[PDB]
Design a protein around this nucleic acid. Structure first.
Ligand SMILES: [Mg+2]
Ligand SMILES: [Mg+2]
Ligand SMILES: [Mg+2]
Ligand SMILES: [Mg+2]
Ligand SMILES: [Mg+2]
Ligand SMILES: [Mg+2]
Ligand SMILES: [Mg+2]
Ligand SMILES: [Mg+2]
Ligand SMILES: [Mg+2]
Ligand SMILES: [Mg+2]
Ligand SMILES: [Mg+2]
Ligand SMILES: [Mg+2]
Ligand SMILES: [Mg+2]
Ligand SMILES: [Mg+2]
Ligand SMILES: [Mg+2]
Ligand SMILES: [Mg+2]
Ligand SMILES: [Mg+2]
Ligand SMILES: [Mg+2]
Ligand SMILES: [Mg+2]
Ligand SMILES: [Mg+2]
Ligand SMILES: [Zn+2]
Lengths: 120, 125, 31, 136, 50, 86, 51, 50
RNA sequence: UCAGACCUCAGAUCAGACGCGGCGACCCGCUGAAUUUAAGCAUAUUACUAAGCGGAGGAAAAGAAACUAACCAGGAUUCCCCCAGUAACGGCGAGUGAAGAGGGAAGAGCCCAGCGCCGAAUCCCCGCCCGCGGGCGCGGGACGUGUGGCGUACGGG
RNA sequence: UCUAAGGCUAAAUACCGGCACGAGACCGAUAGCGGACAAGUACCGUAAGGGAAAGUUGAAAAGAACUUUGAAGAGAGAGUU
RNA sequence: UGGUAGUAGCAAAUAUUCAAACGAGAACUUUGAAGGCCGAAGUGGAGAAGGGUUCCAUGUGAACAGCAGUUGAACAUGGGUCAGUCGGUCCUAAGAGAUGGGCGAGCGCCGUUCGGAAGGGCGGCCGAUCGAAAGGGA
RNA sequence: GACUCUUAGCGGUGGAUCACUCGGCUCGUGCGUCGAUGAAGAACGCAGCUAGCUGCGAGAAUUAGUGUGAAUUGCAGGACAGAUCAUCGACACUUCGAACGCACCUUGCGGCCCCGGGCCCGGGGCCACGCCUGUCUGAGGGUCGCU
């Protein structure tokens, strides 16, 4: 069981494999309390991580399609917006911090610091 | 001497970083020198120890010329187990004696796709 | 399990302080 | 009015220097208190300025000018982007507005030797710091 | 008391499960220094209070 | 009397567990925790007790999210991208 | 009780008369699920590995 | 070329130890507040105290 | 006004944003003691300190003169050295106590309102359309109870 | 001599908290942080708070098989080093 | 860590005895018998607050149970609390406490009607909410 | 000679002393980053055998990705042939807490929308307060107009 082999599977085939792992883990939980054997107790952790692998591919696939659907839209869900830092998300945009008033645009064009050298 | 300000010479820092080193770092620390025939063949002085490698003990009580294959690499204890380096307990059952990798010399290397890639990089420089 | 004595009384021992803080008129006459 | 000392029954337990309760004056002006209350109630806005509009025997009326620093009409104008910065959070609570800065004693000249080096506590801390050099 | 709240009963559940002795296969590990469970609590000597 | 006989008349809990700080300092009649100041919006902390401050400050607990921001800061808070595949 | 009753009807495809639920001292909830009179609790116990 | 070394400022003073006064057959040294701890009743401030 | 506009003031789980708490070493605004010293003690001192409250940032604050000076003049602020335990303050008792100049670290200066010229020349929002920005609307607003451009004491047009 | 009652502005500066490092004429388990350890832990108090003790087998568990006395602890041999 | 010192002490509420069993081991356990006590404002049978697994079964006899113990509220391993109609949940009691408003440098405080307060089906209510396991309550 | 006294050997009690040090303290340097996109702290739960510590969140002693390249290890096991570890840009992240439907000494009491099953049950998404802009619905001879 590998996550790279689950990328091509459809969502219906992943859900079919998901419940097959859930009915298997439940039977291992029954074998744990009924004495069972060490061969089945060691399989509990194996099936637990197989459910985690299938569920991760399902969640990562739908999350990718949601970002593709809201790609380039003005209002995105809060789980699709970037989570950098509450302080960073409240800064001016790259375009806003680069805006200069028309009065400063003339002072920067005309009276910018020239490149020069002094002999002594 | 050591001139890099990024490297430490403190005895406590170097001892803490050694006993608490991760598993992939203990592999590099638990290296062993290659034999004269291997150091000249691959132009590599030392290689990290491997399970199926055959070694010769050069120091201690079990030192000699008998080539023995490693049976276990216990990185948590900084020690390896060799196929013939062992002793008998009180109840007759045999138990392997731990030998440090820096105390054995590699006479034969378990060469796979990854082992040959490291021998090529270590010899390239 | 060959430590039965101390493992059984570890729940019954209580620490105590080092020093426990605990809580005549005498005037004769004829002056 | 002034500031009555909020002590129980007017009993300031201590030396007669601090026995004053009635004739005590607050360090900040009443206009500064108006911006502090206008800015505290509107946490999503930043106080810009304030001015006097009316008086009475018991009331002083002020109008505080607040700004929504997250409105695009404020963030896209470079002349007002300075107040959208995070360093101007609640200027009225730190005495950075026009009315709150007056009570700090700032200024140039011999009148304001007490606030040389930023604030008064910055000046006092520098004036009372024992500089011990290495080769002293 | 018999009249318990869910939070108190759930609190007594956690303190009851922590009152176990240390398993003896812990003492056979490499860097083991624990001889016995030193956080054992008896119902009559140390009261929870909570 | 004031001594041993009085200690037998103690069967009414004054404080209970707090929903904010988890301590047993929530006064039942006051409906106010004497440890964290619950249900006030701000936590009860005072500079006249340095030992009490370092028992419930940032770092004394788990930091389920600050230990991640410390790791994300070493990379510049990168999101929306993935490492180069094999 | 409605969740426990509907769960065992999907995991085992049986019928439930009533569900008695208690919370054990160790923190786990124990459910006493009585089956319909037409079902056999011994037959279901052996089908899932109890007995 | 030598670096400064100094003992922490809070060493031996981060404790609320009050002297029991006289009349307790003790040595008039600030002792730790009472409790169920072996620290309770021990000198905490003087240089002669552990 | 095809009879409604405006002003003022409400409601909403309206559309879209923001505020709250933590930390608080350093920093800003308030508040505020007494031990202690004066061999007592009351002003003074402790101290414009601790504790208390509010507000931030990686720095903060301050900052481009309603300044210093009295010179042959200096030229924003901050910090270091010096001025100096000096001028001065003080039951002129105990004690407290700077600044100009001078030498360095670092150096960067600027923007409005008002005034009067320019057909509000200005801005937000929604939708659509392009590669978080752009055009488009015979779309909805804000705004003349004043937006934008020029322009700020070194003058300016 | 400046032009108050409007605003903005980096650098030199501060940093006992935090994160990551380098170092020591420092301390060396009654010392140095309370805390070299399951330490703000055990424990105490209704509470605010108070708050410890406790590091070292060997190079390698090779941690003493087996025999024997005793119900057993605990011994005698034997054995490891 | 000593002398003290194998000392003080193991003395409130009448009282035990015989036989047997288990067991290395019995004044203390268990069964039987006898003799007694509590004498229904109990040394009886059930709850509340509080305790929190102390409940039950089996096993151990090392530490603890101030003698002993084959026994235990000790230790070790498992088990045990099943509700429409018992209580919580619902109601407000003294109270407590938001909103408007007022105050306050400020965290906040005062305040329980006092403001365009009806989100229902023509509307009156006047005060959100919390507050009883002994009150009310199918 | 019992007892007693001194000295020494040995054996006990006890832990000093010495040696050891993954710790502390101090100094210096570079960064200097929290939160309604749910913080700090707290609760509870999670491992085949797991109490504490530690790490995690019902995908629970970790998933994916990437680097590394044969271990982990107390024991069992075959899960395991990309083992293991590190890193961490993907995903996930229970309850309480600024904590946000109303309340909380209660796993109490609701409302709205949608879906599935038989009004009931289950699931999903929502309903704190303050405030900014806009929208919508309004209010009052408050100022005018039209009647
Ligand atoms: Mg202009
Ligand atoms: Mg400024
Ligand atoms: Mg008791
Ligand atoms: Mg102190
Ligand atoms: Mg705050
Ligand atoms: Mg005096
Ligand atoms: Mg005197
Ligand atoms: Mg203070
Ligand atoms: Mg800087
Ligand atoms: Mg600034
Ligand atoms: Mg003074
Ligand atoms: Mg620092
Ligand atoms: Mg110590
Ligand atoms: Mg019993
Ligand atoms: Mg029993
Ligand atoms: Mg006894
Ligand atoms: Mg027990
Ligand atoms: Mg009620
Ligand atoms: Mg009743
Ligand atoms: Mg001796
Ligand atoms: Zn609390």
């Amino acid at each position: 069981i590998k996550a790279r082999d689950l990328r091509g599977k459809k969502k219906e085939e992943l859900l079919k494999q998901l419940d097959d792992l859930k009915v298997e883990l439940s039977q291992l939980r029954v074998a744990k309390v009924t004495g069972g054997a060490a061969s089945k107790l060691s399989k509990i952790r194996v099936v637990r991580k197989s459910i985690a692998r299938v569920l991760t591919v399902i969640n990562q696939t739908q999350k990718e399609n949601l970002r593709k659907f809201y790609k380039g839209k003005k209002y995105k869900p809060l789980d699709l917006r970037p989570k950098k830092t509450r302080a960073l998300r409240r800064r001016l945009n790259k375009h806003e911090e680069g805006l200069r008033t028309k009065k400063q645009q003339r002072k920067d064009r005309l009276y910018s610091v020239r490149k020069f050298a002094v002999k002594a | 001497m050591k001139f890099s300000p990024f490297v430490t010479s403190d005895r406590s820092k170097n001892r803490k970083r050694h006993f608490n080193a991760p598993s992939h770092v203990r592999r590099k620390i638990m290296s062993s020198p290659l034999s004269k025939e291997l150091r000249q063949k691959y132009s590599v002085r030392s290689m990290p120890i491997r399970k199926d490698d055959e070694v010769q003990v050069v120091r201690g009580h079990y030192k000699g010329q008998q080539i023995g294959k490693v049976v276990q690499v216990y990185r948590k204890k900084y020690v390896i187990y060799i196929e013939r380096v062992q002793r008998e307990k009180a109840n007759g059952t045999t138990v392997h004696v731990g030998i440090h990798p820096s105390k054995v010399v590699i006479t034969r290397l378990k060469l796979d796709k990854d082992r040959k890639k490291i021998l090529e990089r270590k010899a390239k420089s | 399990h060959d430590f039965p004595g101390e493992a059984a009384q570890i729940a019954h021992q209580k620490p105590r302080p080092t020093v426990e803080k605990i809580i005549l008129i005498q005037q004769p006459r004829r002056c | 009015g002034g500031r009555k000392r909020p002590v129980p029954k007017g009993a300031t337990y201590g030396k007669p220097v601090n026995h004053g309760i009635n004739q005590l004056k607050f360090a900040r002006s009443l206009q500064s208190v108006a911006e502090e209350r206008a800015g505290r109630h509107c946490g999503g806005l930043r106080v810009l300025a304030s001015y006097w509009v009316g008086e009475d025997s018991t009331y002083k009326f002020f109008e505080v000018i607040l700004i929504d620093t997250f409105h695009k009409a404020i963030r896209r104008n470079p002349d007002t982007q300075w107040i959208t910065k995070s360093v101007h959070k609640h200027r009225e609570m730190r005495g950075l507005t026009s009315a709150g800065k007056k009570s700090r004693g700032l200024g140039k000249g011999h009148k304001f030797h007490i606030t040389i080096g930023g604030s008064r506590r910055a000046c006092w801390k520098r004036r009372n710091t024992l500089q011990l050099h290495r080769y002293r | 008391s018999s009249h318990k709240t869910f939070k108190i009963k759930r609190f007594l559940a956690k303190k009851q499960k922590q009152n176990r002795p240390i398993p003896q296969w812990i003492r056979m590990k490499t860097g083991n220094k624990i001889r016995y469970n030193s956080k054992r609590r008896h119902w009559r000597r140390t009261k929870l209070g909570l | 009397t004031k001594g041993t006989s009085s200690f037998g008349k103690r069967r009414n809990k004054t404080h209970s567990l707090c929903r904010r700080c988890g301590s047993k300092a929530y006064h039942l009649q006051k409906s106010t925790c004497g440890k964290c100041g619950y249900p006030a919006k701000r936590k009860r902390k005072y500079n006249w007790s340095a030992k009490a401050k370092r028992r419930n400050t940032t770092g004394t607990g788990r930091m389920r999210h600050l230990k991640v921001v410390y790791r994300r800061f070493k990379n510049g808070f990168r999101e929306g991208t993935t490492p180069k595949p094999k | 009780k409605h969740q426990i009753k509907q769960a065992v009807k999907k995991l085992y495809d049986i019928d439930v008369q009533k569900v008695n639920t208690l919370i054990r001292p160790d923190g786990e909830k124990k459910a006493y699920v009585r089956l319909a009179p037409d079902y056999d609790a011994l037959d279901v116990a052996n089908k899932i590995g109890i007995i | 070329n030598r670096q400064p070394y100094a003992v922490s400022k809070l060493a031996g003073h981060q404790t609320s130890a009050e002297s029991w006064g006289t009349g307790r057959a003790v040595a008039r040294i600030p002792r730790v507040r009472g409790g169920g701890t072996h620290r309770s009743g021990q000198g905490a401030f003087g240089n002669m105290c552990r």
